[PDB]
Point group: C6
Chain length 141, copies 6
Amino acid sequence: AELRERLLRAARWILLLGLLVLVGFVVLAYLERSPLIRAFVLSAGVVLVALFAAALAWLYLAAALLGRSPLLALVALALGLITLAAASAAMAATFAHLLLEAPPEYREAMLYVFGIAVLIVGLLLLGLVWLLEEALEALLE
Amino acid sequence: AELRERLLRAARWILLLGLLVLVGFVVLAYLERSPLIRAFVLSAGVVLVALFAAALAWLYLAAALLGRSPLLALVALALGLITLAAASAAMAATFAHLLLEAPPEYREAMLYVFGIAVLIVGLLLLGLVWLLEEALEALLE
Amino acid sequence: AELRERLLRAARWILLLGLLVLVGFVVLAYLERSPLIRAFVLSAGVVLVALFAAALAWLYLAAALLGRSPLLALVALALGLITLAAASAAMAATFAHLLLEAPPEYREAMLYVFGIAVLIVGLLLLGLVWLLEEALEALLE
Amino acid sequence: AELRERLLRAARWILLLGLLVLVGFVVLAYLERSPLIRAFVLSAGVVLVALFAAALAWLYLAAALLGRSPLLALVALALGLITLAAASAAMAATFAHLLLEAPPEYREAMLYVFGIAVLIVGLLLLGLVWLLEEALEALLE
Amino acid sequence: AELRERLLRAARWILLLGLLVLVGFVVLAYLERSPLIRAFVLSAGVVLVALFAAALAWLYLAAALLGRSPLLALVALALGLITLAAASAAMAATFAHLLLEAPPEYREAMLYVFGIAVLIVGLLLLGLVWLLEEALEALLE
Amino acid sequence: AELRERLLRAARWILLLGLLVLVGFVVLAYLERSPLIRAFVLSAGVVLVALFAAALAWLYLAAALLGRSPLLALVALALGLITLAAASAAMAATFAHLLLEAPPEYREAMLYVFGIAVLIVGLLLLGLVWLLEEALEALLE
């Protein structure tokens, strides 16, 4: 019945994980000892908060659509999946570009934060497959 | 009706925060004895005026939608949220590139106005999402 | 009636300012001996002419939508505002990049002409807000 | 009156100007052989042929919509105007970048070809205003 | 009905020329003697295969729309013309950038492959112009 | 009725290849000998996981739109083909840039991986083009 309970629980946990990415990348921006690391970290912080805002947005489009046509919600989740995956890909290319131009002493710690950013927004786009599949099996039957 | 009071009270304070950013980043352009920090500052000025105006545009579409279909406003505000978050990310990414390419003496003061510009254009998203989800609450409860 | 008149009187002056700011950056390009300053000045000429002409296109998109209702104009004008704001901020960001990469001896002329571009931004975006305030009042107050 | 055939009877001369820009820039591609100039010339060749293809595509679309109403012609033609203006401004930006990074001996002749592409832009945008505004008169009649 | 007997024969030779570009550029990738020329050639390979996939998509979108009327195909083919022209112009611009960045010893054969992409572009855009005209002369004239 | 079998069989193999090619690039991300190669590896990883997810999104959009007719899938899958192919082309372009700017000592392993990314999206080029061939056969041939 209320598929929105799953989507909104996912969304508000995604918001809190976005606010933990905020506190985590801001506390790293308070801990870290290079301005080029602080720039990449805080930038990745908001480039990832934008990814949590993307999953928020896609979960709001579904939560509005499933009140009248659930197959339009599934499609909105999928259109958001590819769009948030493009945001992952563009972020990954961007961060590969800064890893090439950045000086060696700030490549090392940055490669991990590139990694963890890529882990968060990669897990997000794959999570949308799991969120829509229960609606997929319920209209592909 | 009721949601428009929140939406448009938010909007015109978002406009005057656009005017305070206009005056604050212009006054920084009158104080700052660096053409490269002046370039960063006025471009952060128009990225933030464009950000406030993105909230103005999507708040005007929400308010004009609320006279006929609140679920259209909810969805339009969500489409505006992700788009404004991408605009935040694009500045926060590109200005992390300028923080690498710039000469050292204009990295230090630039890292602060990178910060304050990112705070202003990022917190704006947390505003827009807190507004739109009242329509999610209203339709589900 | 009144919306198209105000849009079209705005348009005609926006078209004359398109042609005149073009003739201004062309006659500046007749004085300015540096090829890099002429490239910047005439490219500012294009991206500003394109913004003026795009405000014409957004005023014509309103005039075409007005045959359905004023609310079709209000929304399409606002979608033109945010698109113009993005195009403006991307222009200012581009110029804030060229002002770093350009040799020091040609940074001063950039510091005015990216400035006059930012003045045309500050005018153009609020120029749509001012008629959105009217269309909001007429539809929704 | 003539709109469905008129647009396409400017367009076919815009196709011949597409082919005459093609032959002019391909002849220039051996009149001025130097690799970076030939690259900029043939790039301006296809970035202008893409602009003539844009006007061709806009002039096919705007006419084809006219079976519904004149509002469909004016909206599609104008959405092509702004989109062609943006594509032209992006060209003016990227050309203004190559004009910095290219070595001096290939800046001089390139500044003119940047110029003639920018003239063809300045013609095209005012052309799209002049081809449209009969259907603008149809919305004050 | 009859329009697709042209359009699908065109499409399948566009697919074979996609696979034949996918043999000539793919063979060149192990027949050439520089990794930067391999990068430019095989990347031009997919940038051109994406063009044959674009013309494939535009011809499948006609064939699907044609069950309603030819006027849907004419519009989709024109929408694909300008949209493929942008992707083509972005190719020539982008690879003119790599052709500045490349050292002189790998500019020479690279200039020619930029050339052959510009030939395939010129063919493709004049292609969609010829393909819609038999619908234009019938329904539009 | 039947077509969601062919779609979701292709999809689940595309998801498994998403995770397995992800495990290929994650194993490489702790067995490759340079941070720049690991950055290219992980980015080639998520730019392919995003490509696999693009095909997942197009396969969900087909299988959901199939409740109207297979012609909605043909159109959606084709709209997905062009943008997925363009995403591989933009990857191959930006990776031709990193492969030019990176020093020789990190060009060698990178010369395979840009190729293996180019090959692997060929599964998605074919995997959509084959189902476009069947969906075109199904309408009238």
